[PDB]
Ligand binder design. Structure first.
Ligand SMILES: Cc1ccc(Cn2cc(C(N)=O)ccc2=O)c(C)c1
Ligand SMILES: Cc1ccc(Cn2cc(C(N)=O)ccc2=O)c(C)c1
Ligand SMILES: Cc1ccc2cc(C(N)=O)cc(O)c2n1
Ligand SMILES: Cc1ccc2cc(C(N)=O)cc(O)c2n1
Lengths: 317, 317
């Protein structure tokens, strides 16, 4: 035991807890000036005692050397994409088909509803609570290694807030750029004879394709997790909403507008509410993502790949 | 000009025309004994004058040397798979969703209906009317090279019956084994202390995985084309049924039970008719494949990959 090691462990625990409050809860217990006091005190002490430096310390988000290119990662579980609807009647048909296809339809058919973020889908692996790798969705089978870029994201924890993390946990989420950060970036880009971005999605896509993490760190990117891939050494909740509350509870950022609706009429009320809130959110959205809440009914319904919307195989009983 | 070359060109034209009559029309103009008289007369003359041997001659279906393994082929256009339904109401919802999603719905919504063959999906490329390559569907992006095995199939033409073939034409179809051939194969397999097959689909899958084409040729496999991939140097028909009639007209085998139905009620009549014919067809079927006939409405509806049946993105207008 040494005073320095004890000092470094205390600083790291305190900074991680403040980052959770500020980023995931949006309720910081201390001023930003206090968070920075502790942060650069930790950065100073680590440099004075390099033997006690850890790769997952709050001060190690930026890889000091750029990459040459991105490697290819084949996902163990395929990253899915969503099918779409453009009207209340088309949504009501998607529901009616599910009611007919399900063996047993529950009294209230519960849906977990959320705004559809206009971002980029990513997969982030935590091995024993430590961020080891991150990849883009790509084609759903193969993506690109973006580990160094994802580590730079301020609301992405380098380690999970839990004393008993899963052996392996893969978080799937959207990386986007809020309106305020996009406006700063363009003001800076135009007043430095640099490339301006048409919209925040192009700004987010361009930031994640940077080979130098030092640039990526100066791009105000944000993550909101929507789902889990690999999950080993854990009993995941049996409803989709409970899984998102569980990710939130172990340090993962999730969207605050997520609600549970019973049946198509309540789901349509959510779509209308989110449509009227569009101008006030502070980030871009394309619509609403509506899922069946019960995980057993999801497993029963399954997935499609790669099938036309103009053909169906009516199978014999 | 030589008499032998003229003799070989006449034999090849006559045999190809008889194969079309026997396999695609099911109306041979001559007895099987007559077809064989000309076939082994051609085989004899080619061996006596090896300089006039062609790789696409009716006598060159079997590669005399086995393969070591199968190479991988990435399809230029992705090979799709079908979504499914299990009831009249689930089928009626799939239709109702299309009616809501289409910008303009025509007076009769016409469907091209056919029995769902219990076979294996293959892609076959014809370059200037000559069979050059063939592959399995695989995952829809990558498949395996099965050229040597597909050439052995009696109803698969080695050259298209047309004086003006497309520059490149890719035929997509099902390879299956009819009941009569499956019964012979098992009688032979059991009376030779060899492996018997549980059903004709496993018999068909096992035949196409043979590295030696000499074995594959003794397996009574059959093709029925369901669609086109690549098509260069041709104006394809604007309805799906007309494309299948066009493939039939240039020497490609297609299923004889294909019909056009207007609306869901006529389509349900087709499903019931095919369900009652199941015991009489002479090959195995899983249900019926129902497609939108108009190719412009297909292009408008598009395809999905890889999306869950339990989620939908309701997009904003
Ligand atoms: C100088 C400085 C420090 C920190 C922040 C924002 N912030 C605040 C906290 C906090 N209050 O617990 C935690 C993490 C974090 O990133 C800004 C904008 C500027
Ligand atoms: C000996 C022999 C020859 C041919 C056939 C079958 N068949 C017949 C014709 C034909 N009639 O025009 C064309 C091709 C073909 O494969 C069998 C079963 C037996
Ligand atoms: C399964 C899946 C895939 C992509 C998604 C993307 C979003 C999104 N763009 O917000 C939300 C979801 O719930 C998603 N869910
Ligand atoms: C697009 C596509 C893909 C696979 C198919 C398979 C079959 C079949 N198994 O008969 C029929 C079709 O019309 C198909 N159509």
């Amino acid at each position: 035991m040494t005073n320095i090691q004890t000092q470094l462990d205390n600083l790291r625990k305190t900074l991680r807890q403040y980052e959770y409050e500020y980023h995931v809860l949006d309720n910081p217990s201390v001023p930003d000036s206090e968070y920075d006091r502790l942060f650069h005190q930790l950065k100073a002490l680590e440099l004075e005692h390099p033997e006690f430096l850890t790769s997952d310390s709050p001060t190690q988000r930026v890889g000091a050397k750029p990459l040459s290119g991105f490697s290819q990662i084949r996902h163990e579980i395929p990253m899915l994409s969503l099918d779409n609807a453009f009207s209340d009647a088309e949504f009501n048909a998607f529901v009616k088909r599910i009611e007919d296809r399900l063996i047993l339809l529950p009294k209230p058919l519960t849906f977990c509803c959320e705004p559809k973020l206009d971002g980029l889908a990513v997969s982030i692996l935590y091995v024993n609570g430590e961020l080891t790798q991150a990849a883009t969705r790509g084609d759903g089978t193969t993506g690109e290694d973006i580990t160094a870029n994802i580590r730079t994201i301020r609301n992405v924890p380098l380690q999970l807030l839990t004393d008993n993390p899963p052996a392996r946990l893969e978080v799937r989420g959207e990386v986007f750029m809020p309106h305020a950060g996009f406006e700063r970036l363009n003001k800076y880009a135009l007043e430095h004879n640099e490339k301006t971005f048409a919209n925040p999605r192009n700004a987010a896509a361009g930031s994640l394709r940077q080979l130098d993490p030092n640039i990526t760190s100066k791009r105000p990117l944000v993550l909101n997790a929507y789902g889990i891939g690999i999950a080993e050494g854990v009993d995941l909740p049996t409803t989709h909403y409970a899984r998102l509350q569980w990710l939130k509870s172990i340090g993962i950022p999730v969207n605050p507008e997520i609600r549970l609706c019973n049946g198509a009429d309540e789901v349509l009320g959510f779509y209308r509410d989110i449509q009227n809130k569009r101008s006030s959110l502070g980030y871009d959205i394309d619509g609403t993502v509506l899922k069946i809440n019960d995980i057993a009914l999801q497993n029963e319904l399954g997935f499609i790949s790669k099938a036309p919307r103009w053909a169906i195989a009516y199978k014999f009983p």
